[PDB]
Amino acid sequence: TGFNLKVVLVSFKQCLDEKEEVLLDPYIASWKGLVRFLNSLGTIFSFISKDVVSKLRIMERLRGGPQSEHYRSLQAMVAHELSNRLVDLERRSHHPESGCRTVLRLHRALHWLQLFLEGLRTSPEDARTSALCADSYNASLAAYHPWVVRRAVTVAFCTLPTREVFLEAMNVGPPEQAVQMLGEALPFIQRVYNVSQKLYAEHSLLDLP
Numbered sequence: 371t372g373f374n375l376k377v378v379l380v381s382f383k384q385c386l387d388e389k390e391e392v393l394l395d396p397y398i399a400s401w402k403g404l405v406r407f408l409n410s411l412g413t414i415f416s417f418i419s420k421d422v423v424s425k426l427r428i429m430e431r432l433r434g435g436p437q438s439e440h441y442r443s444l445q446a447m448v449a450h451e452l453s454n455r456l457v458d459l460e461r462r463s464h465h466p467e468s469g470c471r472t473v474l475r476l477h478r479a480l481h482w483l484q485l486f487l488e489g490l491r492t493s494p495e496d497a498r499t500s501a502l503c504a505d506s507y508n509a510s511l512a513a514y515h516p517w518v519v520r521r522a523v524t525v526a527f528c529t530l531p532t533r534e535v536f537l538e539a540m541n542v543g544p545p546e547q548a549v550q551m552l553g554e555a556l557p558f559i560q561r562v563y564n565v566s567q568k569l570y571a572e573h574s575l576l577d578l579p
């Protein structure tokens with residue numbers, strides 16, 4: 371029953387080393403956990419997250435390929451792809467699937483997840499899970515999606531259960547306990563997101579095609 375979300379959220383701890391580099395292996399591992407979380411929410415969430423599975427595979431290929439060492443961290447990846455002109459900076463052509471542009475999309479998606487869970491964490495007892503999901507989507511990831519894609523994604527929101535059931539489905543006790551867990555574990559995702567955001571901002575990569 372439900373999903374062991376705490377393990378996945380806490381795994382984001384492993385994504386940052388002492389130098390605050392975002393390590394790609396744990397990043398991919400944590401994201402695979404998030405995909406299993408999404409799968410547990412139902413077929414529509416599996417459907418809309420196919421994009422994320424595809425991008426994780428792209429990153430696994432790069433990390434297993436000849437230049438694997440250069441994808442050890444997002445920092446190493448950026449240095450390697452920029453200096454070797456392996457990133458399409460203006461229009462997608464010769465490197466439509468660079469690690470840089472690919473991780474960018476994973477990162478934007480991560481923001482939705484963290485905003486959704488944080489809204490959930492602080493929600494009143496009467497809040498609807500569907501509204502928390504839509505609101506966090508439209509605040510965040512929707513900005514990068516064409517209106518028609520937003521409509522397709524939105525189909526998913528009404529399939530979510532009540533707040534109580536959704537919280538209990540995290541397998542850590544009643545809603546107030548699940549709330550405690552999110553308070554503990556969310557900071558791990560937020561730190562990874564912030565470090566990643568600043569890295570991309572620093573190199574003017576936030577709008578890669």
Ligand SMILES: CCCCCCCCCCCCC/C=C/[C@@H](O)[C@H](COP(=O)(O)O)NC(C)=O
Nearest residue numbers: 418419421422475476478479482483486503514
């Ligand atoms: C339960 C509430 C929170 C859910 C978190 C959802 C995370 C999964 C990601 C949702 C993906 C949306 C559909 C993909 C759209 C793509 O066109 C887009 C752009 O990638 P592309 O330029 O087409 O390769 N990718 C993203 C992640 O925005």
